[PDB]
Structure 1
Amino acid sequence: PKGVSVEVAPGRVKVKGPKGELEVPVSPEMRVVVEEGVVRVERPSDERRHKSLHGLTRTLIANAVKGVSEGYSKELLIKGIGYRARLVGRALELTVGFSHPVVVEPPEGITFEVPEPTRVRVSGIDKQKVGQVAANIRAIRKPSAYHEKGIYYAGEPVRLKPGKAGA
């Protein structure tokens, strides 16, 4: 872990890196601290809630690091028809079946990108805000249903017979 700048604080491990500055509020119940190339991760016993927080801790903090390690791959695509999506101004302007344009303004921890108005990408740093806000995009529009129209991060459509079924 080269370009890292480590720090271990109480219930929250502070880390800095090339992209952004962040921490992950883990737990002051097992002990971790700055060393070598990485950081030692140890639990003080073999409880089950322990090991839960073991894989948890390990991940959590690694997820903090994945952002600084240039993990700004926040992916979006929109399989449909009249699903224009523009990088106008700085932010989201898109129609996905609705008549009224959908506008979305970016919070801190992300930067914007729209290549061709049929697929969109955000470039930011927080696995929380990644999936929370991106599934909030999948909430901007419900997928497939019978055939295929709407927003899928990269998901898939399953067919449910349209030419009959409802009778």
Structure 2
Amino acid sequence: SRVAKNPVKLPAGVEIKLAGQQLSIKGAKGALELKVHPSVEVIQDSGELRFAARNGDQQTRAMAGTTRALVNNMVVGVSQGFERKLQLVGVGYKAQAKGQVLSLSLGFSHPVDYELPAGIVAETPSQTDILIKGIDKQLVGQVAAEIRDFRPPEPYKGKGVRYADEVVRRKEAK
């Protein structure tokens, strides 16, 4: 496991309250808790964390890599924040955010009002550009997925909510 053998470098300003398996990490943006799997060696020696497997079965070998990946996502989270860019394509497709409610205009006969959960903030620098911000990578990806779920991109004009780096497959009528 090249991932579990790669230690996660703790930056400046991250505290830990490692108690048994309930790891916790704080930062300038928030605090997150992780219940580490009871088969993964997690310990702290310096401003750095490394992960090992208590028993080399196979599930624990994968568990160590996934725990290392999760903790790194935690460390990057509380220190920098995670973001997902969403673009809106199509005439009359507008998105506007008012606090904890995102209002989408996606060619429907009703108003699309999405309630962002706690810890997630959405900004719309343009009427056709969404910006989900948060400290938990899973929640940021989850929220961005449901917003794109309202109108996924179509292959004939690209219209619909899409990720900024998403390669929207395109085609045309023969």
TM normalised by structure 2 equals 0.84
1:158 aligns with 2:158: no
- Within 5 Å, give how 1:100-111 maps onto structure 2: 100-111=110-121
C-alpha contact 1:26 1:60 (8 A) present in aligned 2: no
Work out the number of aligned pairs and report it: 163
3-state DSSP class of the match of 1:59? helix
Question: 1:2-50, CA deviations, whole angstroms, 9 ceiling, x for partnerless residues?
Answer: 1100122344311111101111233122321233111232212332212
1:52 aligns with 2:62: yes
1:149 aligns with 2:159: yes
- Which residue, 118, 121, 129 being the options, matches 2:139? 129
1:75 aligns with 2:93: no
Q: Which runs of 5+ in 2 are unaligned?
A: 1-10
Q: Write 1 or 2 for the structure with the bigger share of strand.
A: 2
Q: CA deviation at 1:90?
A: 4.6
C-alpha contact 1:63 1:127 (8 A) present in aligned 2: yes
C-alpha contact 2:83 2:140 (8 A) present in aligned 1: no
C-alpha contact 2:95 2:102 (8 A) present in aligned 1: yes
Supply the AA of the counterpart residue of 2:150: I
- Which residue, 28, 47, 66 being the options, matches 2:38? 28
3-state DSSP class of the match of 2:82? coil
User: 1 CA distance for matches of 2:168 and 2:50?
Assistant: 43
User: 1 CA distance for matches of 2:170 and 2:71?
Assistant: 40
User: 1 CA distance for matches of 2:37 and 2:113?
Assistant: 38
Question: 1:70-120, CA deviations, whole angstroms, 9 ceiling, x for partnerless residues?
Answer: 123232211222111112355311211213121112211112211111101
User: Which residue number corresponds to residue 26 of structure 2?
Assistant: 16
Superposed CA RMSD: 1.8
